[PDB]
Design a protein around this nucleic acid. Structure first.
Ligand SMILES: [Mg+2]
Ligand SMILES: [Mg+2]
Ligand SMILES: [Mg+2]
Ligand SMILES: [Mg+2]
Ligand SMILES: [Mg+2]
Ligand SMILES: [Mg+2]
Ligand SMILES: [Mg+2]
Ligand SMILES: [Mg+2]
Ligand SMILES: [Mg+2]
Ligand SMILES: [Mg+2]
Ligand SMILES: [Mg+2]
Ligand SMILES: [Mg+2]
Ligand SMILES: [Mg+2]
Length: 157
RNA sequence: AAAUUGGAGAGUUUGAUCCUGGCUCAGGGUGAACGCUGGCGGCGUGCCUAAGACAUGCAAGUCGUGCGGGCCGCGGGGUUUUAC
């Protein structure tokens, strides 16, 4: 029970003697606007069917974004193939200043203020993935402190 | 140049795809010009070209408490032919 978004829809061709033969691809985001978002890419031979598919997939591929007051805990830059996303967190009332794709993903995550640039290939699908991977990677003076102290944590805390 | 105050992309090579890569667009700006249209005010601002040629008018004068005198006169005096 999340909101869904359409990143993008495309049509694609095979070949058989006597014609092209088509298939559809849907890129779908799914969020609960409070720190959980999932991305799904589904292909079927019919467009709405593909989206259904896509939506199913999205919910299985879910990522808990640690939102820190409308924004993300530190800056971060992530490459995926040719494509590369940068996420710089921002102050209140800044807005999601991000491209076409990352926005949709960020918005449904529950993010409200954040800085962004795409870089390298701009391909939707990889930018989609680079963003989801970027968010999959964020940590906290908390998340981090446990990793480093860790090996005797709870002596100082 | 004292809240980390700040960063959006899209179209286009293929039957489709990923990359490379160039082309192109949306933004902001002007000592602007051109089209269509044009009610009022305030503040700015107006030869970017031939540093080409220039009619006319004005654009640096002032001091008589530094000094003598020409011209046109006003008074007021002394005085050898009523001129000095
Ligand atoms: Mg986490
Ligand atoms: Mg690379
Ligand atoms: Mg902050
Ligand atoms: Mg490129
Ligand atoms: Mg491009
Ligand atoms: Mg070729
Ligand atoms: Mg074609
Ligand atoms: Mg303009
Ligand atoms: Mg007119
Ligand atoms: Mg001239
Ligand atoms: Mg000139
Ligand atoms: Mg002259
Ligand atoms: Mg004197």
């Amino acid at each position: 029970d999340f909101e869904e978004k359409m990143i993008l829809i495309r049509r694609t061709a095979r070949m058989q003697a006597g014609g092209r033969r088509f298939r559809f691809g849907a890129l779908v985001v799914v969020g609960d606007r409070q720190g959980r978002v999932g991305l799904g890419f589904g292909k079927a031979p019919e467009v709405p069917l593909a989206v259904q598919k896509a939506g199913y997939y999205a919910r299985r591929n879910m990522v808990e974004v640690p939102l820190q007051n409308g924004t993300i805990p530190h800056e971060i830059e992530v490459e995926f193939g040719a494509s590369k996303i940068v996420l710089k967190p921002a102050a209140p009332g800044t807005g999601v200043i991000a491209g076409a794709v990352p926005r949709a993903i960020l918005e449904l995550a529950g993010v409200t203020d954040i800085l962004t640039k795409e870089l390298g290939s701009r391909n939707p699908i990889n930018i989609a993935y680079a963003t989801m991977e970027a968010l999959r990677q964020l940590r906290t003076k908390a998340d981090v402190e446990r990793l480093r102290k860790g090996e005797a944590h709870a002596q100082a805390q």
